[PDB]
Amino acid sequence: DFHFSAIFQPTDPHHHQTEFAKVEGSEKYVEEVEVFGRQALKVNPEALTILAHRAFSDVHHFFRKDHLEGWRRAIEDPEASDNDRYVATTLLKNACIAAGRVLPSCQDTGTAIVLGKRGELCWTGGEDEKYLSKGIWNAYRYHNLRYSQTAALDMFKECNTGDNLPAQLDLLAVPGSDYEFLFIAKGGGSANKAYLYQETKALLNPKSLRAFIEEKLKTLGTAACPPYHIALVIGGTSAEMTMKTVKLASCRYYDSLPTTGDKYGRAFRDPEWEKIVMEVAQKSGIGAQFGGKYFAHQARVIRLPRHGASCPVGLAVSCSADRQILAHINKSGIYIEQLEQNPAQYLPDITSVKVDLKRPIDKVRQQLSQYPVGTRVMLNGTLIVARDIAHAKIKEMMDNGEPLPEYMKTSPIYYAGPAKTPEGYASGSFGPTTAGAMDSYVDLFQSHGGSYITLAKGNRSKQVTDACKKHGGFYLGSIGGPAAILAKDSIKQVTCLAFPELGMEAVWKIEVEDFPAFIVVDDKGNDMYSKTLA
Amino acid sequence: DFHFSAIFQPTDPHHHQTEFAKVEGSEKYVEEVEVFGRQALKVNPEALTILAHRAFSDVHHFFRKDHLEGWRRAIEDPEASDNDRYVATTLLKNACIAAGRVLPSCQDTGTAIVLGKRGELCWTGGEDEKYLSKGIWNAYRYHNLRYSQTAALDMFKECNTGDNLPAQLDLLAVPGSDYEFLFIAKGGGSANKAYLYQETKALLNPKSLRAFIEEKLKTLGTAACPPYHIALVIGGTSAEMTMKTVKLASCRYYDSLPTTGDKYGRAFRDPEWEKIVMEVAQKSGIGAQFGGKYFAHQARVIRLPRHGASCPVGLAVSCSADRQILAHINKSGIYIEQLEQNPAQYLPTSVKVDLKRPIDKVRQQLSQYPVGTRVMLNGTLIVARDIAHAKIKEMMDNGEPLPEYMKTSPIYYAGPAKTPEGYASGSFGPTTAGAMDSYVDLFQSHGGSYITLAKGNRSKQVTDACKKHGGFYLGSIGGPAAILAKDSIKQVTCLAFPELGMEAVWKIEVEDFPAFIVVDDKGNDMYSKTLA
Ligand code: SF4
Ligand code: SF4
């Protein structure tokens, strides 16, 4: 009566539907042997370093076809809004710059995540973690990427690790003698939009599930740079299993799962509810960051078994920096997924207010006050750059009696942290970070005569709308994601002004030209997300 | 220069601090060999079946010392409340029954979770998941446990798998030639109290973190049968990594981590903030289920590295059914963590309520007492939980009446384990009340469910409903499923929806069933002060 049924039963477990390229000459790293009648593969661990290094270089300059097709859909769909088409065109042009292999597609070159599946008879010598980490170290050290990892010296004392390590290394034991991989360069912003809900059987009916989806999609907002790949996982054997599944779903790792359940509790993809998620996303009006139809590229919905007393639910997105690469090592060598090297083919063959920042900031506020939310502006002049740690350090100084520093009162505040500057370039990739993380500082800083104008991406909380109304302030929404084209075209000079020890989180002073943004919050209580994200 | 630093650097990675017993004769399943100059281990995969079978049998009848010591601490502390001591005494007596190896310690014998670490040169033949699952299948089939897994035939159509499969099988590739395991029989109630929060740098200061902890501990409530092992994980490289870490922390799997961080971002345990969590737990007044000091056995706090833009936070508990077992296979055979087989060494009025009356008479009697009154129920209970409530609401939405069996007796939210041969009942404690909250006002406005019996604090809608309709919520002690079955339950019959397995509607006859009045018919809630 016993019948074993694996939870996950992909019809394409080795991802034959994906195109792979062989690393030239890499068969020298493997040797086929036979022990106790069984075929085994000896793998020189240097192969892991070579593979991880190439994966975490290529993935910052190229995208999958299904990602690029989504941007083209947003440009060509008559139902797309004008802002949809503008955002998608910007992101596609950004991808063309990134394909030059100098600037990464986003300034947040992400956390390095490795899912590895080492066969029982795949013999590496056992030091997989170190050799994979050395390849990741190589990719971020010798390329124009960013060191994004923050070490805790104690509970509250932090420092940047200076090399984007440690990585997340999830190495699984599986049958056979090969070594299979999914590499993910996961941005912090989309990582923040991985949510776990503890629900019940009361959710598991069409009316409740639909209302649930409508409610939760709005909590994603625009804070992870849509158009999104939206993943939704209903059920699971534990919270961590549910969240791992929703991560992999967002990477389209589970696309070949069956589409029906059975009495053994196997996982399945649900196309009907994927369509419902897409319908909710499109009808939400949230759009590709600034109102419209293209909140989502596509949806993945996976139904999992559950303990009778439990119903964990996971919701997560892949952002505009959609970065994953499949790979495998076998008797023929090292193979790595082929990404699209000519994104320009997705660009079709076929209006804003000039804002001079080189003025007293009160004159800039006066000009911005003339326009409603949703107005597109082009910024020209100085920005002062500061994000999470710089804001916390400055509040700490003020809590100790010190004044808000003068450099927080002279120019708009750009929430951003740059990637490393290529030789001969004025700036590395340098797009905005998520605005919501700074929300608790705006009222305090504005009441002390600074931060009247902020520039970042993502919808913000009500306290920021109230502060801007109380203090005559503005929040400007940059397009989220196009860090390479912003660096190449808009950022003319970068200098470090304060807190050099914070690395990418230092206070910078930059000079920009033709920097596009939308007025998201004005000085009158208006918010261009108040209807779609209410 | 490059320097590799693993995130987790336990000083005791092989859990040498744990006592293991060897399965007799199990060296016949392993053979040490040498291939290409390296030591390797051939493992007959039948060893995986034998090990998983014994692990998921033993774990339902015995506990670890640190769990039992916590219960004794609650009984002996002069600062514990009377309710603290009463709950802890009940749970220890429950453990004494479970050590008889017939009744499991809880009716919720849990999801079977296996964390496995197979060495590079540990050769099993590769079919580990099937052989581990067969051993799990054996344990739940051939013992008096429960089939708790719900399969989705489509998005909404469900059925019980009938064997407590599938298991969660997380098999990792590690150095060496051994096979190391953590087995977890994870209750659904404590699995539900695994929470993920997406926070920011603004949290990372003493004042903000302390207020955060005080706020989130209350959201645990009593719904997962405290005293809790409380785990808190600050940071992490992803949500799933944070949630995996907090699960393992709650199993005391990371107790030997370093206690200081470094510039490479290694994980560390934080004893100072563990003490703060325990201080918050004690001063909360929530207590061991019914007010007092013993909300928590102990705390684990792990600080993790984070992306500059991110701060995932994980909070999770291990419940009264604290069930995990370490194990390993090596060249000498199969070794399994030794649990405490003599829990008795740790062991140092109420209102009689007759249920054999019209339910309006029972309601009248209950109305004479304030919340916090301990009652003893004698008579018939109707048993129904999540799926039965959903089916009954569906019937009413289609014009059908609220069934008669929802109007004659108190509703006990519960699902039993299998009945041992010659016993009146298998383990049969309550399930979490909160999952039924959305039904109470509806059922009461249709003339039933005036008295409910379960465990855990409930939402305000239930308090409003009981006040509007003259209802009551009675709180059973949560966890003591074996002693309730042995001493209180005299007859069990399946009443409706037999295809639901343990989630069928049952009719049971009980004697001396202990409970507290948690919500009365006047708007009062005995958790309104501690869980506000
Ligand atoms: S800035 Fe936007 S595109 Fe870049 S990693 Fe963050 S969420 Fe993704
Ligand atoms: S009923 Fe209580 S003790 Fe039993 S598994 Fe659920 S939470 Fe744990």
Q: What is the compact description of this entry?
A:
Chain A: Keywords: 4Fe-4S, Cytoplasm, Iron, Iron-sulfur, Lyase, Metal-binding. With 534 residues, the first copy, chain A, is α/β, with parallel strands linked by helices.
Question: Can you describe this structure?
Answer:
2 copies of one chain form a homodimer. Chain A is α/β, with parallel strands linked by helices and 534 residues long. The first copy, chain A, folds into 3 domains: 1-186 and 322-350, no CATH class; 187-321, no CATH class; 351-534, no CATH class. In chain A, 28% of the residues lie in helices and 27% in strands. Chain A contains 13 helices and 23 strands. Chain A has helices at residues 46-58, 65-76, 82-98, 128-141, 188-192, 206-220, 239-250, 271-283, 361-369, 388-399, 439-447, 462-471, 483-490; strands at residues 20-22, 30-35, 38-43, 111-119, 122-123, 149-152, 158-160, 168-174, 179-186, 195-199, 228-236, 268-269, 296-307, 311-318, 324-330, 333-337, 353-356, 376-385, 413-414, 453-456, 474-478, 491-498, 507-521. In chain A, strands 1-16-15-9-4-8 form a 6-stranded mixed beta sheet. In chain A, strands 10-14-11-13-12 form a 5-stranded mixed beta sheet, sandwiched between helices. A 5-stranded mixed barrel of chain A has the order 18-19-20-21-23. In chain A, strand 22 (491-498) and strand 23 (507-521) form a beta hairpin. In chain A, helix 1 (46-58) packs parallel to helix 4 (128-141), helix 2 (65-76) runs antiparallel to helix 3 and helix 11 (439-447) runs parallel beside helix 12. The structure holds iron/sulfur cluster (SF4) (2 copies). One iron/sulfur cluster is lined by residues 106, 108, 187-190, 224-225, 319-321, 431, 480-481 of chain A.
